[PDB]
């Protein structure tokens, strides 16, 4: 169990804070928010997306093949 006062040594850092009653809960919510999510998407797409597309392609091939395997044409 860790407690405040016993965590670590910090020197020379000033924190400035405002009361929640003095300030906005949703400051510039769309105007700053949607640029940020767009920037976050860009930052991660190339890592996240290409495995799932590679699943989707194996999904769509695999379903198509199995469907087409369960048919004859000569006997």
């Amino acid at each position: 169990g860790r407690q405040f006062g016993h965590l670590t040594r910090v020197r020379h850092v000033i924190t400035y804070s405002l009361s929640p009653f003095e300030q906005r809960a949703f400051p510039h919510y769309f105007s700053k928010g949607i640029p940020n999510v767009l920037r976050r998407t860009r930052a991660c797409i190339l890592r996240v997306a290409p495995p799932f597309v590679a699943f989707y392609l194996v999904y769509t091939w695999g379903t198509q093949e199995f469907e087409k395997s369960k048919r004859k044409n000569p006997a």
């Binding site: 040594r9 020197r11 020379h12 924190t15 804070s17």
Partner: peptide, 12 residues
């Protein structure tokens, strides 16, 4: 007046 906090952390 503003309800606010300044925290000059100095462990030395």
């Amino acid at each position: 007046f503003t309800g606010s906090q300044i925290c000059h952390r100095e462990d030395g």
